[PDB]
Amino acid sequence: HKSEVAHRFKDLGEENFKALVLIAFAQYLQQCPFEDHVKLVNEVTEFAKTCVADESAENCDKSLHTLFGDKLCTVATLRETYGEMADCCAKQEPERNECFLQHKDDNPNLPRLVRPEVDVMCTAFHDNEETFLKKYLYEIARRHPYFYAPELLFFAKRYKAAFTECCQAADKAACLLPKLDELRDEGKASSAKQRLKCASLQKFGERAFKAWAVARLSQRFPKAEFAEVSKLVTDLTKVHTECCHGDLLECADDRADLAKYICENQDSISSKLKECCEKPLLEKSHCIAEVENDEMPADLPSLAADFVESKDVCKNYAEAKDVFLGMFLYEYARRHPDYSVVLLLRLAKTYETTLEKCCAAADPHECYAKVFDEFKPLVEEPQNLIKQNCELFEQLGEYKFQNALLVRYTKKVPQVSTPTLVEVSRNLGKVGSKCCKHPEAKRMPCAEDYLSVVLNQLCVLHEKTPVSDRVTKCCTESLVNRRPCFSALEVDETYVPKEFNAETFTFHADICTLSEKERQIKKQTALVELVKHKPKATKEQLKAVMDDFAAFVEKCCKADDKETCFAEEGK
Numbered sequence: 062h063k064s065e066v067a068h069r070f071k072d073l074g075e076e077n078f079k080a081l082v083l084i085a086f087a088q089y090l091q092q093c094p095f096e097d098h099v100k101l102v103n104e105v106t107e108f109a110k111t112c113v114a115d116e117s118a119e120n121c122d123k124s125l126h127t128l129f130g131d132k133l134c135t136v137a138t139l140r141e142t143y144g145e146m147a148d149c150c151a152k153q154e155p156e157r158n159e160c161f162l163q164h165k166d167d168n169p170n171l172p173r174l175v176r177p178e179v180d181v182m183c184t185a186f187h188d189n190e191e192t193f194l195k196k197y198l199y200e201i202a203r204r205h206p207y208f209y210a211p212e213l214l215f216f217a218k219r220y221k222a223a224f225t226e227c228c229q230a231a232d233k234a235a236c237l238l239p240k241l242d243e244l245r246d247e248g249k250a251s252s253a254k255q256r257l258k259c260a261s262l263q264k265f266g267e268r269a270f271k272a273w274a275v276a277r278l279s280q281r282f283p284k285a286e287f288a289e290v291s292k293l294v295t296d297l298t299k300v301h302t303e304c305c306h307g308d309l310l311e312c313a314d315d316r317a318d319l320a321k322y323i324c325e326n327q328d329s330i331s332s333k334l335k336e337c338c339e340k341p342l343l344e345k346s347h348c349i350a351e352v353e354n355d356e357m358p359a360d361l362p363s364l365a366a367d368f369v370e371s372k373d374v375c376k377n378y379a380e381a382k383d384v385f386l387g388m389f390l391y392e393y394a395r396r397h398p399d400y401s402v403v404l405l406l407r408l409a410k411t412y413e414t415t416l417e418k419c420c421a422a423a424d425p426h427e428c429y430a431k432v433f434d435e436f437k438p439l440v441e442e443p444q445n446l447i448k449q450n451c452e453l454f455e456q457l458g459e460y461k462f463q464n465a466l467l468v469r470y471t472k473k474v475p476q477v478s479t480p481t482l483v484e485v486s487r488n489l490g491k492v493g494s495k496c497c498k499h500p501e502a503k504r505m506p507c508a509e510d511y512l513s514v515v516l517n518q519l520c521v522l523h524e525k526t527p528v529s530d531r532v533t534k535c536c537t538e539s540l541v542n543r544r545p546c547f548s549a550l551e552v553d554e555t556y557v558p559k560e561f562n563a564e565t566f567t568f569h570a571d572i573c574t575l576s577e578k579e580r581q582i583k584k585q586t587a588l589v590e591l592v593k594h595k596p597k598a599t600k601e602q603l604k605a606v607m608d609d610f611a612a613f614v615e616k617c618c619k620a621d622d623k624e625t626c627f628a629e630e631g632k
């Protein structure tokens with residue numbers, strides 16, 4: 062339309078409009094209190110309704126980023142609270158928007174959300190239901206400034222249905238807590254997953270994201286032709302490009318169009334989409350992003366015919382390189398659902414390098430004749446890591462598997478901060494519980510693509526305050542080689558041991574009131590400092606103090622002397 066705020070308001074509806082606007086303000090301004098954002102969203106909602114009445118009204122023709130950007134600069138003393146971020150309000154679009162994306166804090170030093178009692182939450186949900194949900198959208202968006210905004214509406218919908226169903230049940234806690242705990246675990250999984258898509262677009266460009274899109278969509282939709290996948294790749298790229306840039310209104314509007322196009326052409330795409338297109342609009346897009354791999358068509362020809370033994374290999378490649386390379390990736394991904402997306406990108410990167418080198422000779426066919434043999438070592442490298450690590454996880458258990466990976470990556474890069482090393486290594490142990498139970502046919506695609514997400518978490522957490530050059534090297538190298546780069550790292554011998562500090566290993570009775578999951582994080586934190594202090598400590602010596610630690614906390618917390626057991630054991 063002529064008025065862009067009117068086009069999104071009419072397409073998204075008023076309810077989703079207010080929600081996405083609140084997510085936009087909370088991701089950009091994360092430290093601003095909840096009451097300040099409510100005023101801004103309502104003033105945008107009031108202004109949006111005036112443009113729906115007449116698209117030729119005042120200020121209705123300006124861009125969505127100028128509107129949202131000007132409103133962000135109206136909150137007084139933004140420089141006082143956010144420091145030097147207000148220097149970017151003195152800029153013009155799209156420069157002002159680019160810096161507002163630069164100041165997004167992945168770790169925004171916010172206090173952990175203390176969860177009130179179930180009856181208190183059910184009371185607040187009954188008092189002001191509209192305010193209760195807005196607090197959920199607000200608190201989540203601050204701590205996850207790259208959250209998939211259309212998905213966050215779905216989490217908010219299930220967060221509402223949880224309180225609607227459980228607050229009427231006799232045992233409210235037995236109903237609500239399993240749903241709230243599952244929503245939190247699934248929520249952080251969606252955030253870290255979406256952060257990889259944004260980091261791929263911002264750091265490596267659209268070209269690196271389209272290659273990822275061609276691979277995963279071909280694995281998931283093997284029956285669709287290349288022109289149909291290229292249509293879905295181009296549209297899906299536009300959706301995530303807008304969401305990562307802050308275009309949350311255009312993003313959710315374009316995802317609804319993509320989910321509508323996919324569901325209207327299921328026969329040309331996949332057979333697994335039938336049961337999910339019967340769901341509501343917000344639930345429909347969620348499942349399609351997680352639907353199972355469609356059965357690949359039987360009797361497919363070997364890829365040597367089209368790409369190795371052909372006369373126009375260099376002719377078609379020189380005419381359209383990225384198109385010819387895109388066809389190779391689509392044809393290789395649809396046939397191998399047992400490969401990870403990242404592995405398929407390495408093979409496509411390997412095949413591209415060969416054509417650039419071999420098509421220059423006078424006899425190109427004789428040069429790239431054994432190009433597919435070059436893929437053999439690349440396929441076996443992740444399989445050996447997953448086979449060895451799953452054997453280590455199955456014989457140790459998740460918590461012990463985290464500690465084993467914790468010491469491993471702490472010795473690899475001891476410069477990274479302890480809180481970053483703890484969270485990343487804890488999520489590095491969850492891949493064992495996630496997909497070491499899978500057979501080898503589905504073990505590699507899930508294990509490695511999960512590692513790319515968790516390693517990218519270490520990438521962005523270290524990007525803000527770079528303390529180690531080896532992490533920065535493996536992060537900015539080539540994205541697809543992030544896991545091999547990190548896995549090929551060895552013990553950092555140049556690292557000097559950190560000086561001793563007795564205040565780090567002191568404790569109080571507050572650890573006893575903490576939850577079991579929060580208590581082991583307190584224990585894993587001391588293990589990182591222990592490995593940093595003694596980088597040459599053997600694996601069994603680390604157990605003696607950690608086994609001493611586990612029994613010493615259980616002994617002190619169970620006894621009657623509140624702070625005497627902890628203080629007397631401070632020697």
Ligand SMILES: CSCC[C@H](NC(C)=O)C(=O)O
Nearest residue numbers: 277350351352353354507510
């Ligand atoms: C539970 S999340 C699993 C990862 C997600 N789904 C599948 C089927 O791969 C994805 O496409 O990346």
Ligand SMILES: CCCCCCCC(=O)O
Nearest residue numbers: 277316319320346349350
């Ligand atoms: C809106 C439907 C998008 C489907 C593509 C999902 C790709 C993925 O992340 O696996």
Ligand SMILES: CCCCCCCC(=O)O
Nearest residue numbers: 446447450451508547548
């Ligand atoms: C199931 C595979 C688990 C991989 C954990 C990290 C392995 C490494 O890079 O040392």
